[PDB]
Every structure is written in structure tokens, then in C-alpha cells.
Amino acid sequence: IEKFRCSHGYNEIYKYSPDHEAYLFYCKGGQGQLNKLIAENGRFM
Amino acid sequence: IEKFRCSHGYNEIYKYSPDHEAYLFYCKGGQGQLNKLIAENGRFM
Amino acid sequence: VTDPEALLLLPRLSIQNANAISSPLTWGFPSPGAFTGFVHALQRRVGISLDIELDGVGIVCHRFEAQISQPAGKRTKVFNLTRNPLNRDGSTAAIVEEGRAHLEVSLLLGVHGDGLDDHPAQEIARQVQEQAGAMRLAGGSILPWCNERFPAPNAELLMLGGSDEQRRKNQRRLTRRLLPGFALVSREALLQQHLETLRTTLPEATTLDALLDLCRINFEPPWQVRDKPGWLVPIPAGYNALSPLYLPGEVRNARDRETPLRFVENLFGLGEWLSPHRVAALSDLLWYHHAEPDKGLYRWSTPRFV
Amino acid sequence: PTWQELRQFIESFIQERLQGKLDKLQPDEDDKRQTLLATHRREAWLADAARRVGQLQLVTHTLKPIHPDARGSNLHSLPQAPGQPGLAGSHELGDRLVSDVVGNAAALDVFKFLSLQYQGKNLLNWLTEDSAEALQALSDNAEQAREWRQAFIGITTVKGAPASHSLAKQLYFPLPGSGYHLLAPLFPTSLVHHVHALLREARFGDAAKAAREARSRQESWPHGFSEYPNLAIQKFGGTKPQNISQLNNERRGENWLLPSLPPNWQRQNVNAPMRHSSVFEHDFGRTPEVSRLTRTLQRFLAKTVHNNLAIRQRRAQLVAQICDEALQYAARLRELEPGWSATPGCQLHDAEQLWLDPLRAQTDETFLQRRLRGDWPAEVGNRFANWLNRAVSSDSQILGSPEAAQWSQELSKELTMFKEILEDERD
Amino acid sequence: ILSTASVLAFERKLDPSDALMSAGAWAQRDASQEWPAVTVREKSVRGTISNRLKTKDRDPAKLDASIQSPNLQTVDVANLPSDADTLKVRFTLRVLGGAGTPSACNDAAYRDKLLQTVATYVNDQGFAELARRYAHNLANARFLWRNRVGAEAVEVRINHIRQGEVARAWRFDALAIGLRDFKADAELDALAELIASGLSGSGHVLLEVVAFARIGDGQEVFPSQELILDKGDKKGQKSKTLYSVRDAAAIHSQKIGNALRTIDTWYPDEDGLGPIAVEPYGSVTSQGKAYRQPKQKLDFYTLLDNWVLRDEAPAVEQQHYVIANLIRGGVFGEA
Amino acid sequence: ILSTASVLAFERKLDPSDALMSAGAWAQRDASQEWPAVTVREKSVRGTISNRLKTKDRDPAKLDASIQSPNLQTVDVANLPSDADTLKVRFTLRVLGGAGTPSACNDAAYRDKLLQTVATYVNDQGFAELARRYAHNLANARFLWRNRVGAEAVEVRINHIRQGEVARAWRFDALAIGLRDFKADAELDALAELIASGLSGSGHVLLEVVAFARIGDGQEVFPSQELILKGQKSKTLYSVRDAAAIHSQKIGNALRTIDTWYPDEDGLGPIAVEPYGSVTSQGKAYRQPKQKLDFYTLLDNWVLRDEAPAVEQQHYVIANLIRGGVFGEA
């Protein structure tokens, strides 16, 4: 289960939250900010 | 375009910054510190 | 040394420009030797008149502010200096960097002697307070609390209690009074056993390196910082001999010619800033003088701590 | 171990110095090459170097960091080990002594001459020990070798009667019986140089830089690294740091003092709850230190029993610390401001009655003081335990295991101590 | 032979504190214990070049290229609030006492000779010319250094503080008491006898000095400026940093002390300056020139040697200056 | 030989304060002591590219690619409220006096010569031409820098403040008084005599200058702007305590704008009195040292070798001494 989800056309990064079963808005940015956040935090929770 | 500017009466060395088009305060000192900084960093940017 | 018969509390004392340079390796709070020498100067100036022996000192430090400034783009700090006068020609003199700091400490100094029975407790408390008002604590003037809301007075707690409960009760009363500070104690046994564990890790390790390891925030791979028990700091724990002890009238340019001189060098121990109600015994947490002059080793510590 | 190899080595050093001076001379006339080849090439170089020894001195503890118009004595003395355990300084340096040099900056050729490791050891170390290959390379007859040996040894010996200037520090020490020792301390340049080297490899060393980068990559490095926050830089020579010492040119000033600071060295100001949302946000009123401390409480979820003994000890002293700074925050609010009774309303969480200790008795004589001395409001421990119960994770396996039982018993002991200190507020 | 002691050191008597400045409105100065503090804040200054040019920067192409690039700082500034026209500067001062006894002296013969010389002076003429001038420099608010030069009215309140409460309160009009004339007054002489009894006694006499000045609404006040070397490397930093103890602007204690020591009217050069600070080889920092040179026989060291060693007692003005140095402090001694 | 002193420092006469700007409605300017402040708030901006391309960027595909990614900033902006059309800018100004005396001087001979020079200036002609121009720059609201350039009506109220209260009040139409002509009036000459008696040291002068600019509802006002070292925060405005303000040195530069004697034409008008009299907006130094008309050559000829300049040039020299600075070499 992926920790971050980039909404691609809308330039928003959604980070998974475990309390409610959903993604919440983390920050703006595209694929580069998504990959940088994956490198920092690690994907797959 | 000179990299350092000594304000002579006030004993302040101003170093040129390129982002804004102006000089900013670098350190205190007079002609000797100015010449020593010119020898270290090179003038004319 | 000997245990205190009473425990005088000098109140919150404001020191305006104390020596923030404790040692050649440490800056920050002044050396505990300043406080032990201050208490011995108090004994030298009123203790011979009130027939008491002021000995030992508990350091609390309600607030502290080093006159420092972090420069732009650096993680380190520098010291705000003073402008010394010019020389006889008008040239700027060579700047010698002195650290200055504003302290608010309170001194738990132990008192014992035959003067406790001769005078009232508030009388000798007011006497040593009126003497300490005209003194200096680490090179810094003692600010004497004029025209504020109310002066913080003294309370000479008698260490001899009628019970264990009365002893704990007025000890808790005193600890509530010196509560917004942080007591400074000497923790050398922890430094020694940290030397032993670090020598088990890699051999021929100095306790200079064990001290440095206890200071730094070192990171560990799985990343996690190393936990530290309490607020561990390096302190200068006295002096060690570099020279044979010279005769009084033998060394050139001494302070006086009736005192033997010996060139010495600092000894860096370890201290721990803890809240004062952790110790459960305020008869402890007092900094004494241990010379052993034949070997060198002029040092200060808090004996009877643990 | 042959004197001929030592002789051609020192003549190579002399001619290297000569070609250096003629290369940085830029000469075209005036015949200074004749004087340079007469003085800086032959065995006269050894004679003027043996003359120039007496300006220099090998030292470990100099006076010049204390106010630089201090013509006192400097010492090359290594102190004996303290018999008492714990404390240490500069007697740890057995083979790692750097041996600072003081004296004139013109006569450094004597030191760079004497510091050489020609055979396998130091030239002063070969010249102090009487041997065969020593006393023969820098000679043709014996007596000039004698006087040049007694010249080259004396760089480690003090010069003049022992003295410390009026600008130097001299501090009395109370002896146990009576009387004093005058104790003039000196600046340890060797110990400062060793700690400066250690801090330089700790901050700018490549083995530290690699682990610092691997922390950002979040990969596993073999070793770790350190940071050393809150260092203070202290410079000794003002604009000419060379006039103090030799090792004051490696570290250009820059004493690099370690922080010895009390924990209240960052002044935190006071903030009392006023409104309803201020009573909501300022009941706990939590500083960055307690969040840093409870972040470590959340990092104590897993436990193996042999480690869990020390982990439970750490949790015991940790909850003692969180009680300590809770009582500290309450005390500094209760003595600092009258803001707990600044303005009334309906929402202040008034059941606390610990953050307003002089705000209810020194103003209201029988209205709130008799409503607090007989009631003895100390009930903040169970609400603080409810707040502290968040610090552990709400895991079903964590509550089903006995770790929650150990957590609750140590928490109950520490809230009992918080109760015992919180009850005695009427004395 | 009675040579000079190799370690001489006198502790600083007349020890002031850091002069905290706070602000409020005039004609409610008596309720000025809850006046809010003057805070040090940041502002950006941008200037053209105004220095003298070094005769190689006087090409008008080079000048017009230079003034298109201004020089930007971020200075600290301390202003009064926009609805407060009075600066309240409030420091304390301990007059310690034992003014002749050195903190360090080598030769016990020299120490007893110096104590005999000082007691000869005190029994001859006590601290009554010196404490009158110290009471003047407390009376006129000279410690208000640049906060005094444009004030409408300066009023200085001095309170002698006994064990916990005020023992005696003064009040001066600091603009009427000039900056150059050490005249006579009843309250000034009462303060002079108090500072004399401080400097002569064994215990300390504590004074609380408060000074108000009408500057104007929102005008700039001048706290002490910090001497920081190593301003920074490769970034933009502060050119002027103001002293502030606890988020509250302040004058350094040594600046207040230099204002209190400004009593020396006896230096042999003419008094175009007026009084200067009491210093050995009396050297005004702003002037950059050291009066009382050792070329003449009128510095501190040669006067102290002639007074103590060979008993050549100088004029009463010069020994006023010598005892003023002994109250000032200092670290003396040869190799 | 009388060379120049190695230190000279003149204090700043004409000390202004931070000019606080608040906002309300015109025709109730006389009840404008409780007007709410103009608060500096933030807003977002999008820019397209608009600078010149350096002929490597003139690829059309590269230009469209730079246009598709615009720069986002967050600027500080100060506006009037939507129900307020008048900007009240208020500051106080201290005219100190003792203009010729330096705060520091090494050479006592040079100090006495300079004091004699300024004394024969003041005796030959008072601070009357200079205070006329300083009272003009108070009267026409030049210290309203960009808040003045499109205002319907500007009105300045200058109150001389004695002990606690207004000793004498002035009131001007700041658009009738131009930004370039120093003419005569009764009230301007009264204010000029007040500033003259202040600069002569013959009185304590503290003014309270309030200026109302009638801009329009909700329009943009321009407080002073600070230096910054997507949310790039490209603009920061000066505000003292949640209330926009002009820097005191900007009010000081607008008060010093009296120099109409520079050797170039008078179609530009008054500039600020500076050594090597320079306007940074025009990038050009009038009073260049190639001509003998800067501050330093005029002062060094007037004081050292007694070459008194023209009367307007010594007006400029004494205006520079009123301005302050460090003169003298290293």
C-alpha cells in the first residue's frame, strides 16, 4: 500500500494516512517532488 | 564590476551580490582587509 | 570533607558579566571553582568574624544568558566583546576575547561552626548577604536587587532535624524555593564507567575521548541518535601540576611573596545539570575543595553525591 | 644509521632551502646570490641555526593565549596521571603530542630542521640519545658537535627563572589544613590542538561526511557520525595569529570551545491561558523539549528482556524527567507572572490550582486561600497521566503484553512522586 | 630601595549595571514601573556611496557604475513607540569602598607605602572632590550618551537603597546641571557625601539611578552597540547590532562606567573637550588621541611612582586624578 | 599645513521617525487620532516571463516551455480598506542644531578652522535658505514617496510640539506647493523660521508631521520595503507593530531633497544633498569629482585653503553637514 500518491494533472501529492483509510493532501508538486519524497520517507508505508 | 567595495570612513566591506543588483555587508575592516579579500577571492566577480 | 551543620541559602543572585570562558576547552557556565573560591572568599571575609566555617556550595542557576552571537551562515557562535581603551599613541589595542554572561544563580553553601549557637540564624544570614552584595562571582558584579517588588531574603536551614520527617519537610520547603533552576553536580564515576565501556568497545581509549563522546550528539546506523542520561556537560574539574612547587619568594612576578606557586593545567571532568528535587538530600550537591598538594591534583567535585 | 646518509640528507635540506630562497628572490642584479651561497648553503647554516635555537622553544603549555603582552615562562611538561578516576586532560597524549613552538617567526628553519624523521625517528630524539651516528654527521671535529648538540637539545628546556606575568592568571587554592598554593595555569596548546584535530575530523572528516550523506540517503553505513552543536569560536591573535604560537597557524585562532550550558540557556517566556481556546491549548502548554523527550517515549515500543531491563530503567528516568520539567514549567509560571489571575471568564481549567499558587492566596485572603489549603488541589497527576498515556502506541499487542503492565506501574510510581511533591504547596 | 610592585591590580569601584531603557509618556513618570521596554528591531537601510574616493575611483564612468549598485544592510534600530515621548533609562550602581586597597600587590613594603599614601590623601582631603564629580556625572545624565543631545527635558532620579527600601531620594534637572561645570548644590553635595561614605567605608553603598528624557513620539533612542568580530562569511549579515539584555534594549555597564568616570578636567592640554574619562595615558576613544602622555610627567604611572616611591607629591588636581584611577581600577605591573 | 582630520563624524541633524501609515475617510481628518492602521497582508502573484532574452533563450519552443511554467510568489501588499480613501502618514521630526560641530575630531586645528568656517557662514547668512527648503519638503508631502503620485488631494498638518501640547499648528495644501519650486509664503516662512531657530541651536524644535493623501477606496499604498535573503516571498514591506510604515531614512532622504544647485540642468529639479550628489533612480552622479563641485572638494577648499565657494555651493556644503556622515580619510 503506497505511502504517497501524486495526482498528476493537478500537481498535488497525497500522503496515505492510516487512521482513516484514505489519502490526505500533503503538498504540491509533481513527479520530481513525489520521487524526492519517496527517497526521503520510503514508499509502501 | 567590482566584487568588494570598502566604505572608507565607516570601516565596512561590502561584497557584491548578483541576485539583487546591489552590494551587501560582508565584514568590517579597511583597506588592508579589502586588499586581503581581493587577494583571496579575486576582484571583478 | 566534613558534613554541614546547617545549609544557608543565598537567594537568586544576579551576576552581570561572569566569565563565560570556563576553560580552554569549555565555554558557557563558569567553572565551579569560581563558586568554591567565592565561598572561600566569603569565609575569609566574614566567616572568621562570625566564628563559622562556610564550606561547600550548591549551584542552581535560575537563568543564564551568554553574550554570544551566532554569525550568518555558521553553526558556531562568537562572543560579544568590549571596546578597551586605546594605547598611548591612539592605536586600537590588540583585542583579547573575553566571554561575558548574565547569570541568575542561588548558592546553597554549607555552614558549620560554633557561631550558629552564638547568633540568630537570620542574623548571620543577613551578614553574609550584606557581604556578598559587595563581591563578585566569576568576574561579574553581583547585582543587589534594588527597588523591585520585594527582596529575596535568606533562610538558613538547620541541617540537624528533630525527625526524618521534619528534615524532609523543611528540605522540601527549601527545594520549592530554589526550584526554577537546575542544580549542577560532578559526575565523574559515570565518566569513568563510560571510559570502561568505550575501552571495551575499542581499546587504548582516553577518557578525553569518552568525555567528547558524552558531549557530542553521535548518530547510529539502524538512523537513531544516541540517548544521553540527563544533561551531561564538560566542566573543568580543577588543576593538575605541571611544575614542582616553588618557594614563596622564588618565582618571579607572583601575586604575593608569602605563598608557594606552581604552574598548573586544567583537568576536564564531567558534570550533570539536573533538577534539584531529584537528589532527595540537599546536604549533598555541594562543591568542595580537594587539593592533595604533594601530588598536584588541585580539584573540586561534589563528594557524597551518590 | 650511517652518518653519511644523514649528512647528505641535511645538505639536501639546506640546498632545498637555498633554491627556495633564490626562487622566491626574483633577483637580476646586486649579487645577492653570492651572499646566499655563502650563508645559506655551507656548514655556516648549521652555525647560525645553532645560534637561532635560543629564540625558539618546544612547549606544550604557553602563556600567549592569555593577554599577549605577557613575557612569562612556557612549559614543555606532561603532567602525571590523576590517581582519582574520571577527570583527565593533556596527560592522555603519549605518542600524539604535537609539541607547539613559541618564539620568533624568523627562526622557524631550526624547527623544520629539527623536526625531521630521517632514519625512523625524530632528529631531536636521535640527538638527545648519545649514540654513534649522532654527534658525527653535523661535524668534522668533536667539540663543535658537542656545542651544537647542547644547542639543539635546549629547545625543549625553559629559559630564565620561572615567571608568570601580571597579565597572566594566578589563582589561590585553599589547602586542607591551611595556607594556599598560587596555581598559575597555562593554556594547553597540545591538548587544544588534539581536540581541535578530533573535532575537525568529526565535522569535516570524509569518514564523517560519508555517514552524513548516508543518513540523507537513509541507507545503512558501517559507522556513525557526530555533530557537536553550540561550539564557540575564540580567536587569540587579533589580526596576526602567528605571533602567539606555531600551532596557532594551523588553527588560525579558533579555540573551538565546547558548550557547557545549563538547560535553561534558551530563555523561554511565559504564557497563561486566557480564553476558552487558550484554556484548551495552554492546559498542557508544552515546550519543544518535552516533545523531543516523548518522541523517545514513542521509540521504546519493541523490547527484548535483557535489553528491556535497561530500557525500563531508561523509561523510569525518562518519566522522572518529564515529571521534572512539568514541575519546572508549573514553578516558573507560578513565580514568574500574575497572568494566571490576570483576567477572568468561564474557561481556565480552574481545577488545576497549581499554576496560580500566589495568585489565589496573596490576593484573596479567605476566598480562595481557604478554598485551596483545605481542599489541597493536587489532582493534576491523573490528568497528566491521561496526557502521558498517549505517549505509548495504542497497539492491541502492546496492551495485551506485560509491557503495558510495566509501563503502568512505573508511571504510577512517578505520578505518586508528582503527587507527593504537588501536595506540599501550603507550607 | 622600594621598587615598584610587579603585580598591581585595583578592583573597579563605582560598579554600575546595564542601563535598561523603557518608554512611556512624560508627566506620568512617577508610575513608570510598568512602562514597556524599548525593543531592538531590524530594518533595511540602502545607501549610495558617500565616502571619499581613493582618486582611482573618480572616473565618472566608474562612479556612475558604482552608484547603480547601492549597498544594502539590515541594521538594528531602537525607537520609542509612536505614542510615547519619554525614554526611561534605569540602572543601579554599587559604590564599593576600600578605594585604596589593591586587589593584588607584590611588595609588602610597596603595599604599606601605597596604603600610607592613600590614607594621607584621605585624611588630608577625602573623597569630596571626586565624589562631587561622580555625583555630577550621575546628576546630569551623561550616561544618556546620545539620548541626551536633543532632549527637551532630562530628569534624573537617584534613590539610595538601604536593606530593602529607599533611604533617601534625589531628583535633578539634568539639563540645568551642565556637562562641563562641576558647580555646587545642596542635593548634589548630599549625594557627594553619600558617595564619599561609600568609597571610604568597608561595605557598599547602593544607588538606583533613573533618567527620563523627552525625545519625542517614536524618535530613535541609542542603546549600546555590540562589538562583534567575525560578522560572518559569504552571506549577508548585520552591520550594526544593538545591546539588549532580555528583549529590552540596554546600555552596556562599561559605557555607563565611562560616563561616570568623565571627571578628568586636569589634563594639561586645553579644555576644548572639557572633562574626559579617567584613564592611564588618558585617551579619548572618539578623539583617537591620548592626552596625559608619558612624554610629560602627567600620566598615571609616573605620577603614582613619584607619589609613592620618591614621595614627590603632585598637585592636588593630579592626585585627585591618581586616586580617581585607583577608584577606576586597572591591571598594572612590569616584567 | 592644516590637512584634513583623520576622523570627522557629524551627527544627523533633522532626525525623523518611522512614518506610521493609517487609513480612514477624508473630511473626518480632524478626528483622525483613532484611525485604524494600514496592515501589511500577503497575496499570491503569477508572473509570465517579461525580461529580455539573451539570444540563447530566443528558441520559440524554449520560450513556450518557460511560459508554461510560471513563477509563483507571495508578495506583501498594503492596501487601504474598501471603505477608506485617505492615507494618514504620521511621523515626528527633531531639528537639533549645532550643525557645524563634529561629534568626533582628531585634529584640533582642523576642528577650530571648520568651526570658524561654519561660524562665518552662519553669521553671513543664517540657516534661512536651508530651512526654507526643509520646510518646503515638509509642506509638499514629498515624504509620501509613491503614495503622492496619483492622489486627488494631499494635505499636511505640521504641529510644533512644546512641553506637552501643540505650540503652533500649520496646515498646507501639498499639491499647490510644487515638488520643484521653492517659493515664498507666510506660513512657509513661519515654519522656516522655526526650523532655522532649531538648526541654529537657539531652541528645541520637535515637529509632528501628519500628511493625508486622498487616494481612493481600497487602493494600494506603498510603505517602505525590506531586504530578503513558489512561496518565494519576493516582497516584504516594513511594519513596526502590525502597522505599515516608511523607514525613517526614507523620510530623511525626502526631507534632504533640497539640492537645486548641481551643475547639470534644472529641468530635473531638486535632488537629495549627498556627497557626489547621486540619484540612484537615474543612475547618474551629479556633482562628480571631475568637476570641482562635490561635497569633498568644496569642503576641502573652503576649510583648508580658504577658497569659499559660491553662496549656493556653501548652502550645499552646510546641508551635507546637517545630513551627517564620516568625512576624513583612513
Author numbering:
A (entry chain J), B (entry chain K): 80 to 124
C (entry chain B): 3 to 224, 239 to 322
D (entry chain A): 8 to 434
E (entry chain I): 24 to 358
F (entry chain H): 24 to 252, 258 to 358
Original paper wording:
Consistent with previously reported structures, the Csy complex adopts a helically twisted ‘G’ shape with Cas5f, Cas6f, Cas7f and Cas8f protein components integrated by the crRNA. Here, we report the cryo-EM structures of three type I-F Acr proteins, AcrIF4, AcrIF7 and AcrIF14, bound to the type I-F CRISPR–Cas surveillance complex (the Csy complex) from Pseudomonas aeruginosa.
There are two AcrIF14 molecules bound to the Csy complex. In contrast, the N-terminal domain (NTD, aa 1–80) shows no direct contact with the Csy complex and is built as a poly-alanine model because of resolution limitations in this region. The pi stacking interactions between Y89 of AcrF14 and the crRNA are sequence independent and will likely be maintained with different crRNAs. A comparison between the Csy-AcrF14 structure and the Csy-dsDNA structure suggests that AcrIF14CTD competes with target DNA to bind the crRNA and the thumb domains of Cas7.4f and Cas7.6f. Simulation of AcrIF14 binding to other Cas7f subunits shows severe steric clashes, explaining why AcrIF14 selectively binds to Cas7.4f and Cas7.6f.
